[PDB]
Structure formats: structure tokens, C-alpha cells
Amino acid sequence: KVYSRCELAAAMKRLGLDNYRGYSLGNWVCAANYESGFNTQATNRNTDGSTDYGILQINSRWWCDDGKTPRSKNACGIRCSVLLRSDITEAVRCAKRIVRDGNGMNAWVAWRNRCRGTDVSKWIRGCRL
């Protein structure tokens, strides 16, 4: 599913991301925009045998099990396939753990590069949440 920007903003707010561990809602919407373009079915096969999954491009070496990533852990306790679903509930739950365990959003390279230095509230402009 390709979410609209505001549809995703509303879904993320309902699941508790606004100001989660100090990151306003716009951070999470901005991150999704640049990581996946709001596509729940996005993947990125990395050279190192891991794959990034879903709307937040969560990596299979650390966070979820895809059954084919050498030298892997499953910190979120999920199959990576749950991150390719239209319902973002499991992706959000895992993203929260990523931000707890990493003390921030630096796990998301596109957020680091495209979101940090911007007014991330722009990503919530117009949105009925």
C-alpha cells in the first residue's frame, strides 16, 4: 500500500509516535517519506545479505527475521514479512524499539540526511489527524 502523507501521519499519531522519546510526529512522517516514499512494500536488498523492509526500511540483520540473513538477530520478535503489510502497527512497534535501543533516530540514514535539519512540521501541514 502507498499511504498518502496525511493518511500515514494520522495512523502514526493513533499508534503513539507523536513526541515518542522526544521525536515529534513530523520526524516519523519525514523519515518514512525518504526511506520508502510511503510504500509498505518497499525493500532494499543490501550487499551484506540483509534486507531493509517496509515503510521505515527496518533491517533484517538486527530487528526482524527473514530466514535468509546470515549472522542475524531478531530484536523486535517478528518475521520481516509483517513489515510488508498495509497495517503499520507492527512497523510502528518495532520502530519504537529501534529509537529506545539506539537513543534516537540515527538508525534511519535518510532521516539523518533529509529530515534532521528541516522544519519537520511541514510533513504534517494540512493533515487531519
Side-chain angles (χ1 to χ4, degrees), residues 84-100:
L84 299 174
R85 299 298 298 274
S86 293
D87 182 340
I88 69 166
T89 302
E90 294 302 326
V92 169
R93 185 177 197 276
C94 186
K96 287 177 178 171
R97 184 181 300 275
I98 292 170
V99 74
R100 289 192 308 271

Side-chain angles (χ1 to χ4, degrees), residues 35-44 46-51:
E35 291 285 343
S36 68
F38 308 137
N39 186 14
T40 64
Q41 294 185 20
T43 59
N44 192 356
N46 298 311
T47 308
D48 67 16
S50 73
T51 299

Side-chain angles (χ1 to χ4, degrees), residues 36-44 46-72 74-95:
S36 68
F38 308 137
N39 186 14
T40 64
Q41 294 185 20
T43 59
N44 192 356
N46 298 311
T47 308
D48 67 16
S50 73
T51 299
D52 300 336
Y53 289 90
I55 208 164
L56 284 168
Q57 291 291 280
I58 291 171
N59 186 265
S60 65
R61 184 150 277 120
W62 306 104
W63 303 109
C64 64
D65 196 353
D66 67 6
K68 65 187 175 180
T69 302
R71 302 179 58 203
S72 71
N74 182 3
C76 293
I78 48 167
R79 297 295 295 185
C80 301
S81 56
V82 309
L83 302 174
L84 299 174
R85 299 298 298 274
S86 293
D87 182 340
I88 69 166
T89 302
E90 294 302 326
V92 169
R93 185 177 197 276
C94 186

